[PDB]
A paper describes a structure:
report the characterization of 4 highly potent NAbs: F4, F6, F7, and F9. The structures of these 5 complexes are almost indistinguishable. that these NAbs prevent HAV attachment to the permissive 2BS cell surface. binds to the BC loop of VP2 and the BC loop of VP3.
of HAV by F4, F6, F7, F9, and R10. regions of light chains and heavy chains of F4, F6, F7, F9, and R10.
Author numbering:
A (entry chain B), D (entry chain B): 5 to 220
B (entry chain A), E (entry chain A): 3 to 29, 40 to 272
C (entry chain C): 51 to 246
F (entry chain A): 3 to 29, 40 to 93
G (entry chain B): 112 to 167
The structure:
């Protein structure tokens, strides 16, 4: 007695979210295998979530003048809304997912000549620049920019929010809010440049992505 | 699984290359007293299609009575097959022909009978070839042949005309110098000098004019001629042991097999 | 031949003025070892680089190009540059890319005034083919065969602040060498100045 | 003798592709740390390259009729060009990268009533449906659809190409080409439906991504 | 120190020859989790300029798929490149050409396309070369070629004329005797017979007419001719394993690369 | 690092909650014969800003004379407002 | 080789040791020779040490 094998009827295939139940199935027909390149055409590491989402992006460029008075607000920007734009590489991950949970890395850069003098403050305020005191902005995660000492500050913050995640298509309120206030006025002499340029870099850290969706 | 897939069935390898040696040899009977279960099958299942066929009681064929195996590519295509032929008509001229694997180029300006059949059996070719040229005609003619890779400046293909290149550019690519009275033949390798992985024959569009040609051989003659005598060259290609062949493909139909 | 190709030699020269806007593309560079644009007046000559002299004698090239950007400020200018790399080929419409869109690509910033002067920008090998052809022997274009692996843009990231008793521009030299370089299939060719 | 420490001048920061050399640096100011959720707001696994790129996408819908003759071509489609579209989630990874190297998983589905009879073939032809024979389409990685036996075939192929990678913005030639030929004609009786629907699913496997670029 | 100097700093070696093999091979990743400190540097310090560059996370390129290394001088210049060409016009004549490495001598009376590029990449050349001549044209022509070192009496260079030397002086320097009907080619070494250490290409003044040439090859033909037939010779140089190259130099610009 | 970053400097934690108990207690002198290096500092560096301040020779305050700690939230706001 | 700029100036120089002749070679490839770069922001002294290179 010999047994004649037949084709299998029921099977479940897919890749981790598409599930296909088939009443009439068949085995897969594969030719070849995966090959390595002994002479590589690209020597960088291949693309992933880490090298596309966790990378610095320029989000804002302001300019600090000698006519701005004390406590004048040079930059008032929502950090997460500016990273949600088509011109950045992180949009390709955020356009199709619904919720996220992330940390933020900020780097603020200025360039004075050493004939100038003055100061700035760069505080990370969560949610809202509310009725709190301007003179108490050193309670937040902050950084002081002095024209004599440094020209780069960098801040690292975790996820602080009233819910479990952030919804990009229809947000409740902004997660973080960066403010840059004039902490001491910019003074020059005769002939010195009456300005200095400012740039803000931002990136995600520990990016979690949930619920891929068709509608944008 | 690396890609995150899942399945309750079994995925098997389909159409494995070289399943059998094409010489009669021994690796009693072939089929016997046991009932042939391999007669009935299902061809739509790639697992059940790998079953060995039998329907009738047979026995072993024995052994063949010649040593070589004619069903191997490196012995079949080790024989040198015809490539092209052309004649000269004047003095100090230069002829240029590429070795194009493309099936769009019909002969005489393309691969003839046997080489057109072979280079459309597979997808990818990688490795050095083996050119033999044969001189027929006049004598006391000095000639020079060189090899130009694809992507570099060279004269117009399939056209006999004066050369627009200089002697510093010709001899820097590597050249041979012969005389038609002494030899009448040159057996020369062709190096694999390309910027891409492999060349292919069955392509269209702008991929047909880029990824089909791999090299280009051109010949210039001097001291030809005296009053009335012809000069004819004929080229022949063979394959080497350094060459490789990948991804077998459906063969050409009976209307694309053309010759000179 | 790695004795000459691993030497960083000067290829380009551009100023960083104080009268340019934020996001303005200062200079664009095709990413291939055949690039140079410097020339001299007395004597009349076209200044080749050490990498373009070796690589012009081959059909196919492969490897990681290393750009070196040396700035010449005082201690009193202050600004930033953005060096962006858009993968592709030597013919892509690249002038429509805004400053916010350029941070999608792999990029790097540079603070000008400091104790260091040179930023080394090692470009990774990004291609669809394993090698890349010397097409400058030919005279017509063809879709599929190319010389570069993309173009490199220089942006004005922050403006140039400075006093009145210094100059209102900073000049940048661009050097050009190669690591993990592989070339084969020799020929003869004499290059020409990329007039951009 | 006591040593008075000062702020560091030179430092290199960034995330794996953005390199910032600073002549005037400062340490990073971080508040808090990364926290786990003991009561999670999302119970799926978070988003990555595997769950966004390696997933089945519907690429084509044809219909097989009783009026198509023998060897008629029901579907002739480039596989990789159809996956390079805005409507799919894999576009967010491919819009910003330049070159790629990938395998393809195909699933073809039909639905006949058991009063119909006929057959199809679904071959994966690399590059070009050239001058080769139609009767020799069983040399390629293929699958046979018979109205009596099965209704699902699935094919798995490696990367076969003349170069080292594939350029989406300006391709040389298509990598794969799926064809669906009529292998035996569709015959019905009186009153039976004179059609059957067809659908093609496709996804990447072993996706490598190289060279992120600003220009699209 | 032998010379009596002193310093508080460290003197390091600058631009060491041959730092890397130009084939893809393995001597995980190249760059990784650690922050790239080699992105920022100072190029004015020769110690800090030897730091390995990295800025982006990469991995290893793998291995190449051809055996040879095309980036070596002894394999690149092992290919024989073009040197000169000339024709004869009368009977019993003698032609003389030197192998001058100088960049001042423009072609046709100098090094053509590829040899002019190569011998201006370095300062000093020492060793024997490798000459191949190719005969194109007439037949039944008896010819004789010999080699004269620099500093000895010989006929005028680049001029075809009657020979003022005797047969005792020609055959004492070592000569070959050929016939244009039998061979059509001569592959001959060229000995390193000089009174100085090495010859150079990039010189001016009276050092250009003394330390540039190293040898001088001249050819005399007899039995040429009958009524109407041309005779053309072409010369090609290759490099040997006994030769040496010293002190790399800035390459020629795009207006000095000239050809024939 | 998990996110792929790199740096040659040291990142420290800024403004750590509850650095000191707000009752007078003991956990000789506070400052002494050694010269006060904590008088001069740089406030723009968050590492150097965590240095303990001293400028004048002092001694220990001793212990308070009430049991509770009024500077705690759970005792301040335990009072019903 | 020694220079002395005030720090309100900016510019650069190159100081290459070329044996024999400043021939037809490239000016942009003077960093192949034993050289030194003088930048008005970084340094003001470069020093070079070379052996004997000659045809005799």
């Amino acid at each position: 007695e010999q047994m004649i094998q037949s084709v299998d009827r029921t099977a479940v295939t897919g890749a981790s979210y598409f599930t296909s139940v088939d009443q009439s199935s068949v085995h897969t027909a594969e030719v070849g295998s995966h090959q390595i390149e002994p002479l590589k055409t690209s020597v960088d590491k291949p693309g992933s979530k880490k090298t596309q989402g966790e990378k610095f992006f320029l989000i804002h460029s302001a300019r600090w003048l000698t006519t701005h008075a004390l406590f004048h607000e040079v930059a008032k920007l929502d950090v997460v809304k500016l990273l949600y734009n088509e011109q950045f590489a992180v949009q390709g991950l955020l356009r199709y997912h619904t919720y996220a949970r992330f940390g933020i890395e900020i780097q603020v850069q200025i360039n004075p000549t050493p004939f100038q003098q003055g100061g700035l403050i760069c505080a990370m305020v969560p949610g809202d620049q509310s009725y709190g005191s301007i003179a108490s902005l050193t309670v937040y995660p902050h950084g002081l920019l002095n024209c004599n000492i440094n020209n780069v500050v960098r801040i690292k913050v975790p996820f602080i929010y009233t819910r479990g995640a952030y919804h990009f298509k229809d947000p409740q309120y902004p997660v973080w809010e960066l403010t840059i206030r004039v902490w001491s006025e910019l003074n020059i002499g005769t002939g010195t440049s009456a300005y200095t340029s400012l740039n803000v870099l931002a990136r995600f850290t520990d990016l979690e992505l949930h619920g891929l969706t068709p509608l944008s | 699984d690396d890609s995150g897939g899942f399945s309750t069935t079994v995925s098997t390898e389909q159409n494995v290359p070289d399943p059998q040696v094409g010489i009669t040899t021994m690796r009693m009977d072939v089929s016997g007293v046991q009932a042939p279960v391999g007669a009935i099958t299902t061809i739509e299942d790639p697992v059940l299609a790998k079953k060995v066929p039998e329907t009738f009681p047979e026995l072993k064929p024995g052994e063949s009575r010649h040593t070589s195996d004619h069903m191997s590519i490196y012995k079949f295509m080790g024989r040198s097959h015809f490539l092209c032929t052309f004649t000269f008509n004047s003095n100090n001229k230069e002829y240029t022909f590429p070795i194009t694997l493309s099936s769009t180029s019909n002969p005489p300006h393309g691969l003839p009978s046997t080489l057109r059949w072979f280079f459309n059996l597979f997808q990818l070719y990688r490795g050095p070839l083996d050119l033999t040229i044969i001189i027929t005609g006049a004598t006391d003619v000095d000639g020079m042949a060189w090899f130009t890779p694809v992507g570099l400046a060279v004269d117009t293909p399939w056209v006999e005309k004066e050369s627009a290149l200089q002697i510093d550019y010709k001899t820097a690519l590597g050249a041979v110098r012969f005389n038609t009275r002494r030899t009448g033949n040159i057996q020369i390798r062709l190096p694999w000098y390309s910027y891409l992985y492999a060349v292919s024959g069955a392509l269209d569009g702008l991929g047909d004019k880029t990824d089909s040609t791999f090299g280009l051989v051109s010949i210039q003659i001097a001291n030809y001629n005296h009053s009335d005598e012809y000069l004819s060259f004929s080229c022949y290609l063979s394959v080497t042991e350094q060459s490789e062949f990948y991804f077998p493909r459906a063969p050409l139909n009976s209307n694309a097999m053309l010759s000179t | 031949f790695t004795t000459w190709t691993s030497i960083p030699t000067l290829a380009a020269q551009f100023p960083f003025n104080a009268s340019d806007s934020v996001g303005q593309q200062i200079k664009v560079i095709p990413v291939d070892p055949y690039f140079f644009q410097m020339t001299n007046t007395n004597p009349d000559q076209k200044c080749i680089t050490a990498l373009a002299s070796i690589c012009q004698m081959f059909c196919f090239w492969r490897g990681d190009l290393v750009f070196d950007f040396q700035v010449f400020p005082t201690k009193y200018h202050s600004g930033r540059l953005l060096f962006c790399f858009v993968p592709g080929n030597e013919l892509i419409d690249v002038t429509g890319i805004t400053l916010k869109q350029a941070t999608t690509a792999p990029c790097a910033v540079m603070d000008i005034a400091g104790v260091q002067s040179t930023l080394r920008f090692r470009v990774p090998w990004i291609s669809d083919t394993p090698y890349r052809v010397n097409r400058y022997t030919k005279e017509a274009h063809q879709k599929g065969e190319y010389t570069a692996i993309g173009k490199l843009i220089v942006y004005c990231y922050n403006r140039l602040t400075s006093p009145s008793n210094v100059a209102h521009h900073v000049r940048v030299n661009v050097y050009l060498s190669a690591i993990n370089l592989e070339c084969f299939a020799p020929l003869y060719h004499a290059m020409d100045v990329t007039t951009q």
